[PDB]
Write a protein that binds this ligand. Structure first.
Ligand SMILES: Cc1cccc(C(=O)N[C@@H](C)C2CC2)n1
Ligand SMILES: Cc1cccc(C(=O)N[C@H](C)C2CC2)n1
Length: 480
């Protein structure tokens, strides 16, 4: 890395100077670094140019606003300071060049929308890796090669993508937040494909702002959920986008690319999804639960088809796709009730989890759950009302009671019910889980909510070793 090569597209006359790393933080700007001095909300990095210089940086790139002209080269204490107008907008491009254009050196797929980003990215990364890629993810659960995901500016994004390319990644599925997009955090990334899952006067400016952003990015193949009203607006203006539906929203008159689920059977271990597409038809056995996960899987399928992965190979590998651990994670065993472990710990999340589970439930739906002690109490009766409404059997138990009296938490939950006497209460959590699993019938479904993959139960100030997954697995005679 050299300042002159780095800046060649923009600043013809920039001095040669070897560079080490790129940083926005004057506090970690080491000797040989490029410090980038950006102006944000209540922050002016140019204030810290003296400090960085004093810490021995090789060079500085700085916001030109009010201070200089675009491309102006100055020199302070023998250190080149190059000024650029609209530096926030350009930071992604600058960092891209610094880090050798990582998005041109793997297949990058970006997933945007309110929900489903995490699951859809995971599915993209898993399925592509099943077809021979070395895949990675960047998103809410962290960054890394699959299995090694470790728990944010335009520089950081490019740096992390370069790290992945360095570790041998050939495919990356990235969550792209609305906030990230607006703050130019992905501005110079070359997306192979861009996926839209869903959106949760005004409508004209919102739309306008997002269209403007779209027009400025390298989105690649566009893959859009046609079951969402906003998705259909995108599709109306993008004739080469791929429309995906599990209802009747594909308009066959447009002769565009499409994928639609024609029949879905939600069963005790997943969903059987029959589909047609402009690539051919097929049937997939998904091991994920609920309708929204059928949509997420279809989006991943359509994306991979769009990118040229063969339908036959995707079909042969689909049954290996797994849920994110502790997210609507299904446990079945021959002749036992189906048990779903989900992290749902809010009224809305609990409601969605119950509605998803219900689709797969021939019998009674059980819900085992509690609420955290020494935290806001407001959700407690709301979760009680939800469990009573959307399950057939509510089993109220403990969930990280901490220092709060466990039964007091349970009381708050029960207080939200129309008919609390119809709820079952069982303390200890392990005991409650066991109660549901051992009493439920073979065609029942038991949702164990609140913990997902979090393998502890906080009682007092002790983190006790405890896993919903392991509890369930042992009861069913399976392996967590
Ligand atoms: C770009 C494309 C490809 C295939 C089908 C379609 C499609 O059904 N569009 C619908 C949802 C129109 C109202 C927006 N659009
Ligand atoms: C991943 C990504 C990056 C940059 C822009 C975009 C974008 O405007 N996406 C739209 C929602 C398009 C329907 C797919 N998506």
């Amino acid at each position: 890395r050299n300042l002159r090569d780095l800046l060649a597209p923009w600043v013809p006359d920039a001095p040669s100077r070897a560079l080490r790393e790129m940083t926005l933080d004057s506090r970690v700007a080491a000797a040989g670094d490029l410090f980038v001095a950006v102006v944000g909300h209540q922050a002016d990095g140019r204030r810290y140019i003296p400090q960085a210089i004093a810490q021995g940086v090789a060079a500085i790139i700085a916001e030109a606003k009010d201070e200089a002209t675009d491309g102006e080269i100055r020199e302070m204490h023998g250190v080149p300071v190059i000024y650029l107008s609209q530096l926030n907008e350009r930071l992604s491009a600058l960092a891209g060049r610094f880090y050798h254009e990582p998005s041109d050196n793997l297949r990058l797929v970006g997933v945007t929308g309110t929900n489903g980003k995490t699951t859809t990215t995971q599915l993209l990364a898993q399925w592509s890796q099943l077809l021979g890629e070395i895949s990675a993810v960047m998103g809410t659960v962290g960054n890394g090669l699959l299995g090694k995901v470790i728990p944010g500016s335009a520089v950081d994004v490019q740096h992390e993508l370069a790290g992945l390319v360095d570790q041998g990644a050939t495919f990356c599925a990235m969550e792209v937040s609305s906030h990230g997009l607006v703050q130019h955090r992905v501005a110079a990334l070359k997306f192979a494909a861009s996926v839209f899952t869903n959106l949760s006067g005004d409508m004209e400016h919102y739309e306008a702002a997002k269209w403007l952003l779209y027009s400025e990015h390298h989105c690649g193949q566009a893959i859009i959920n046609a079951d969402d009203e906003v998705g259909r607006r995108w599709l109306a203006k993008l004739p080469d986008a791929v429309a995906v539906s599990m209802e009747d929203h594909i308009n066959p008159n447009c002769h565009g690319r499409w994928l639609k689920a024609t029949e879905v059977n939600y069963h005790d271990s997943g969903a059987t999804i029959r589909f047609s597409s402009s690539w051919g038809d097929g049937e997939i056995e998904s091991h994920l639960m609920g309708a929204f996960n059928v949509s997420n899987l279809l989006l991943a399928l359509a994306t991979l088809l769009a990118l040229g992965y063969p339908l036959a190979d995707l079909l042969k590998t689909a049954a290996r796709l797994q849920p994110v651990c502790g997210r609507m994670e299904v446990f079945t065993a021959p002749g036992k009730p189906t048990v779903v472990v989900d992290y749902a710990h809010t009224p809305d999340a609990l409601e969605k989890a119950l509605q998803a589970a219900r689709l797969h439930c021939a019998g009674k739906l059980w819900c085992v759950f509690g609420c955290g002690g020494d935290r806001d109490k407001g959700k407690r009766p709301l979760m009680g009302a939800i469990a009573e409404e959307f399950a057939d059997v509510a089993v109220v138990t403990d969930d990280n009671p901490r220092t709060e009296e466990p039964r007091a938490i349970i009381n708050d939950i029960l207080a939200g019910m129309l008919d609390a006497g119809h709820a079952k209460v069982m303390e200890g959590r392990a005991e409650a889980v066991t109660c549901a699993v051992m009493q439920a019938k073979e065609n029942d479904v038991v949702l164990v909510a609140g913990k997902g993959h979090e393998d502890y139960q906080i009682v007092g100030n002790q983190r006790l070793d405890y896993s919903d997954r392991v509890t369930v697995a042992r009861l069913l005679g399976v392996i967590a």
